[PDB]
Amino acid sequence: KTPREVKPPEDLQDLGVRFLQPFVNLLSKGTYWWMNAFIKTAHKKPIDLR
């Protein structure tokens, strides 16, 4: 009966404003696939501080 379900900070504590590895898997945490995505927009649009 008991799922001991969850308290995931990866999404929750992030609250929607974050930039780092934890939500990414160990694989990307070694190979920066998320960082690939992050750079993906830097071509189509100049980055900004917001």
């Binding site: 929750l12 609250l15 929607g16 917001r50």
Partner: protein, 328 residues
Amino acid sequence: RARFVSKKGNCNVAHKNIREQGRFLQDVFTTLVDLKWPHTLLIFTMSFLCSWLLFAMAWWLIAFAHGDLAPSEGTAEPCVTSIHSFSSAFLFSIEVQVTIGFGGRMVTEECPLAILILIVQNIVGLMINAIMLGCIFMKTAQAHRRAETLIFSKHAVIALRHGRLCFMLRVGDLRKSMIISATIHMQVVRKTTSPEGEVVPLHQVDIPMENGVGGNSIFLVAPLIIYHVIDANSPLYDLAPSDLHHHQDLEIIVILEGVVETTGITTQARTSYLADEILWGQRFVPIVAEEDGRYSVDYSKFGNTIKVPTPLCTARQLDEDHSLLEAL
């Protein structure tokens, strides 16, 4: 003191001694549709098994009555080619009814009764197949998968709007798929009594939502707030703070009814709020923000509210003191 409807739409009421029986032979389909998947699966599988085995026994018995298992003399031709064991007749029945028909075991003209059996099994196979397929269809077109995504905050708040003290609650839809003709029926329930004296345990009063038109339809894309303005005609016009509590006979039944976008069928979600869950004097914090070229519905902190004081008396005494202060 039970909840009328669970916080997840469960109608928490047992029937206990219906008089009559069920539907003669139509309740089969209805009771078949809404039912746990593995049980329905098993029922259909076992229907196919029994249909196969029955005609398997039939074919085997026919071959045995034709005197076709013993002789193998070469002269007399079988009712059906090359069957020597009940296993053979069973394979044959499967080949027939599933419409496979390999050919190594084949019906012959030597037994017209066997031809009758063939016709019978084909007709039965088509009938049972169409029944199973109609059931599987109307089951795979099932609703209430969406009715679980239609979320409702665990709490409802009251506040002051337009100088009036109106009961509110936030509604939530999580799927991008759209509900059509989304209609709200807030409905307060309690054990209330007429002046003449009759009391009914679960009395039900349709409390109208405050809509600029007055109707009950909404257009839910971003999870919004549903609210009732408490007027002297609303039963909640005698409600006061601190009267609400989990031991106060009080509950407001919230009904959401609309058409699924992909499937033209209709679904209904239910949620309820008894007295304590109705937080007094708060406001749901706006979970929407103008995103970068977008509207950002922060679904996090969804039902998170904020406390605000208020005149801690009935809307009755609200209008009392208000009339006393306006006619001054």
